Design a binder for this molecule. Structure first.
Ligand SMILES: Cc1c(-c2ccc(N)c(C(=O)N(C)C)c2F)cnc2c1C1(C=N2)CC1
Ligand SMILES: Cc1c(-c2ccc(N)c(C(=O)N(C)C)c2F)cnc2c1C1(C=N2)CC1
Lengths: 291, 287
């Protein structure tokens, strides 16, 4: 079973499919309008042939289903009919932050600070449920018309969760296994603080329209990060940003995960606990986006 | 593989009987039709072939007395046949399941031979990762050979294919990248596996064998896990208890290497020769 609450009916009987969303970057996601109501929803359709493995699909749905938080994109349910699975989610009218800043340019420090607080609130909830996003970036941070910040796309989170569960289910005999090998089999070799690092990179991305080292080959970036003298990235223009923002970058981009602060600890940081942070900052950004 | 034979292995070999009950796959005892020599032929039905290619590369680049020898590979009719040295007594597990527990001297000799093989493998930057009684083979001469690099090849192939499909790492944390490049552990896991194997040969099971395998994985991570010990304390000498204690060192940063372990009192003691296992095999034949 993909889900004990699947609607075994075609969603086109309840929804008018309006247009495609995100250019396929997030999959086959459509904007859709309810028929008896005006309510708008996002519908992501996945082909479902019988001989396909649906293990990764089932985890993603369960991750989205089990989240009830104001900074995580809302889940409505799933439709299964005629070998098509439609995942029904809240429609975030402004797209991702990457779509936004490609139009408005770099965000103000206050807008970045608001985003970082809202993502940290979502990450704190996720981590408290023993979940790891593992794909925090501008493209996976959606903004709705109400100016709210919602984390989205747990696809990578599902791939990893099903991948580790696959190897565990067919683990065979671990009775001769070494404790560190068993740890990596169960826990995967890292923890939820990888999300804190990704947020730090995302804050730079919102400041500069690019993550650091974006022109470097992917395998060369992985190669540089695994050397003893690795230097965590920094903001380009020092005089453009406050010391609080610089310190926020410095602590979120701590090399050693054993010293990187948690999502909850980071919520007490000077940058994201300042009084001038409110949704008006985002609604102001959407006004600029409307031009 | 450019040295691969493009023919039916039965051109050269007479297939005599299946080996190991299928635990090791489709493995055949075979006689060389001109030499008369005996070999073991593993038949693999051939999709991805990177894991199988890696397992053979690990094997053919091994030239050491304590690693089962590699003779060649036949490719014929979607079947790959890997020709290896035949160990006529099977594995230690096959043996102690009829003879009972090994003597300490026999166990000490076994451990010395495995450490020799492990030290050679690690000097090639290879990790066995599946050391246990079933993978320690014994020939009729009482000599000891490590076998079956199936797990080893899988771990190497999975780590390479994940690097091929990693995505964009610009937002990725460095400890995530280190796992993608180095896996999370090193060759010192084999030393731990040898310690458990030593207990297996002494007590006919590894520790916690009656515990559910997933719970066993869980207990090993509880952050307070304690390394196992030998059950009958007075039955074994202090060198054996200490050998188990140092091979079963929890932290990998402090676990001794194979080469270092080779200078431990238990494996450097005199009288350790294949005659100890010739006695074991004779017990298998008579008792
Ligand atoms: C993908 C997505 C988006 C989205 C993202 C970028 C976009 N550029 C657009 C777009 O095309 N717009 C005209 C706004 C978009 F709709 C908005 N909410 C969503 C989703 C999901 C669930 N809720 C993840 C599947
Ligand atoms: C599997 C194996 C064995 C073996 C192991 C257990 C056994 N129980 C028997 C057996 O059936 N015997 C009648 C002795 C056996 F032949 C002997 N040498 C081998 C192999 C391989 C290459 N060389 C690894 C593939």
């Amino acid at each position: 079973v993909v889900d004990p609450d699947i609607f075994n009916r075609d969603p086109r009987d309840h929804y008018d499919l309006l247009q495609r969303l995100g250019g396929g970057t997030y999959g086959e996601v459509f904007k859709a309008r309810d028929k008896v109501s005006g309510d708008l929803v996002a519908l992501k359709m996945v082909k479902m042939e019988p001989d396909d493995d649906v293990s990764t699909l089932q985890k993603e749905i369960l991750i989205l289903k089990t989240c009830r938080h104001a900074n995580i994109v809302a889940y409505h349910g799933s439709y299964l009919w005629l070998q098509k699975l439609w995942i029904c989610m809240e429609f975030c009218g402004a797209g991702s932050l990457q779509d936004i800043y490609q139009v408005t340019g770099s965000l103000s420090e206050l807008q970045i600070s608001y985003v970082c607080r809202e993502v940290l609130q979502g990450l704190a909830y996720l981590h408290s449920q023993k979940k790891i996003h593992r794909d925090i970036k501008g493209a996976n941070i959606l903004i709705n018309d109400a100016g709210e910040v919602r984390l989205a796309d747990f696809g990578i989170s599902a791939q990893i969760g099903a991948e580790l569960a696959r190897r565990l289910e067919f683990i065979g005999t671990p009775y001769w296994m070494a404790p560190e090998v068993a740890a990596v089999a169960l826990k995967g070799g890292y923890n939820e603080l990888c999300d804190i690092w990704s947020l730090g990179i995302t804050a730079i991305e919102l400041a500069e329209l690019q993550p650091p080292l974006f022109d470097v080959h992917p395998l060369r970036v992985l190669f540089l990060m695994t050397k003893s003298g690795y230097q965590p990235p920094r903001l380009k223009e020092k005089g453009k940003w406050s010391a609080a923002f610089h310190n926020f970058i410095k602590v979120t981009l701590t090399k050693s995960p054993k010293k990187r602060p948690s999502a909850t600890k980071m919520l007490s940081h000077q940058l994201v606990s300042q009084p001038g942070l409110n949704r008006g900052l985002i609604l102001d950004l959407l006004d600029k986006l409307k031009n």
